[PDB]
Amino acid sequence: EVETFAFQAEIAQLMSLIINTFYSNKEIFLRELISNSSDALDKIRYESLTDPSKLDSGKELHINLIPNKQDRTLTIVDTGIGMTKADLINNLGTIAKSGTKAFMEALQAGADISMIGQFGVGFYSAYLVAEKVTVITKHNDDEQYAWESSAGGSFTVRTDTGEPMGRGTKVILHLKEDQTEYLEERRIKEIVKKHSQFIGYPITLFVEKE
Numbered sequence: 001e002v003e004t005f006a007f008q009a010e011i012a013q014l015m016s017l018i019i020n021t022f023y024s025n026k027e028i029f030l031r032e033l034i035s036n037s038s039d040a041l042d043k044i045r046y047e048s049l050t051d052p053s054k055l056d057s058g059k060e061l062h063i064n065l066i067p068n069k070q071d072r073t074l075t076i077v078d079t080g081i082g083m084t085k086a087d088l089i090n091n092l093g094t095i096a097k098s099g100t101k102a103f104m105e106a107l108q109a110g111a112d113i114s115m116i117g118q119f120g121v122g123f124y125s126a127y128l129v130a131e132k133v134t135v136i137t138k139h140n141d142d143e144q145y146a147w148e149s150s151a152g153g154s155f156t157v158r159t160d161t162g163e164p165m166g167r168g169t170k171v172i173l174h175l176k177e178d179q180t181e182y183l184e185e186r187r188i189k190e191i192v193k194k195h196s197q198f199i200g201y202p203i204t205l206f207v208e209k210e
């Protein structure tokens with residue numbers, strides 16, 4: 001049921017740079033993932049204007065932030081367009097190869113990690129704070145899939161059997177032991193107000209019952 005794939009060499013080199021560089025400004029990961037969710041919501045909204053049945057899988061367009069201190073996870077959920085199996089296995093890595101190479105150029109010349117988003121590879125900044133990332137996703141045209149990687153040069157894809165989503169994407173960050181500040185409600189609110197105040201969809205921060 002689970003298929004294992006190698007990352008393309010450039011992506012693998014990027015993930016190793018991100019994991020093993022000393023860089024203290026790690027909070028930018030959350031800005032980049034919210035920006036990704038916003039773009040995904042823009043895309044389904046646009047598609048729905050000429051085919052309203054694209055929203056039959058769900059009319060709400062929003063972003064939820066869900067910390068869980070018991071599992072040490074931070075989950076970002078959106079109801080955007082989602083990703084197909086072809087996206088997860090090939091398309092995303094292929095479009096990213098070009099920006100990755102330029103980002104690794106931009107860096108040695110005189111750039112810092114915070115500009116990662118300008119090269120279209122902001123997703124990989126998740127590995128600043130995560131030892132593992134799980135992505136659950138459902139596109140209109142495909143089934144529900146789970147993607148997972150602890151970096152390491154490989155990732156897995158499997159059909160997901162968990163609770164159905166309808167449509168969209170769930171990024172689950174399994175946080176490193178020393179990065180648990182991003183589970184605190186005060187800290188998340190500081191980052192969102194600082195970096196994402198002008199996002200055009202409701203962002204709901206769920207509170208923990210613990």
Ligand SMILES: COc1c(C)cnc(Cn2cnc3c(Cl)nc(N)nc32)c1C
Pocket residue numbers: 036037040078080081082083088092123135147169171
């Ligand atoms: C499988 O994990 C990803 C990989 C390997 C590369 N980029 C993105 C960003 N990304 C691309 N499309 C995305 C959509 Cl439709 N939505 C979100 N929220 N992120 C996306 C994701 C989630």
Ligand SMILES: [Mg+2]
Pocket residue numbers: 062064204
């Ligand atoms: Mg809600």
